[PDB]
């Protein structure tokens, strides 16, 4: 997905955190596929978000949470 389809909501209480520490950084595809395989191993997590920490890579796992705006033009 793209960052334009995201609403920030810090009140969610159904999420997990996982740091991956690397100073001399590996290929970002490797840690990306590792976190995707980690969510693939489980069944409850449906959304995986990767963010670049200064000393690590933060993988955040969420259940499917959406905010829908319904109107007479477009949902």
């Amino acid at each position: 997905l793209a960052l334009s389809s995201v609403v920030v909501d810090p009140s969610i209480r159904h999420f997990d955190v996982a740091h991956v520490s690397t100073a001399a950084t590996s290929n970002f595809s490797a840690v990306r596929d590792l976190c995707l395989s980690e969510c693939s191993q489980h069944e409850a997590c449906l959304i995986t978000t990767l963010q670049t920490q200064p000393g690590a890579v933060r993988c955040m796992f969420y259940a499917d949470t959406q905010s829908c705006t319904h109107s007479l033009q477009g949902q």
Binding site: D9, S11, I12, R13, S67, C68, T69, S71, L72
Partner: protein
């Protein structure tokens, strides 16, 4: 009045968007029925018509918030399915005070 479904179950189940009742319903009725759909869905998903999830607790934006029904005096809040969807406090206070306090004592 030709229908058998009254206005609350008209709006909650969303009659104005039906293909059968195509042009019979106005536009503001079609928006209000969408808001009442969102209320009933948010209830039967989470348990609170203001929030779609049990854990999100984001501020509602689609309509005005629906207050809880505290049973004592000073509250007893209820939603009104009007165009603006306002909040009120007393529903039939004189009539239910007659039918509960007085006439039950007269019955005994």
């Amino acid at each position: 009045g030709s229908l058998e479904l009254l206005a609350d179950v008209q709006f909650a189940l969303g009659l104005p968007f039906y293909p059968a009742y195509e042009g019979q319903f106005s536009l503001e009725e079609k928006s209000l029925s969408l808001k009442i759909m969102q209320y009933f869905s948010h209830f039967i998903r989470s348990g609170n018509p203001n929030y779609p999830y049990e854990f999100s607790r984001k501020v509602p934006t689609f309509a005005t918030p629906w207050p809880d029904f505290v049973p004592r005096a000073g509250g007893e809040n209820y939603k009104e399915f009007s165009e603006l969807l306002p909040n009120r406090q007393g529903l039939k206070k004189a009539d239910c005070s007659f039918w509960s306090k007085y006439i039950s004592s007269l019955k005994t």
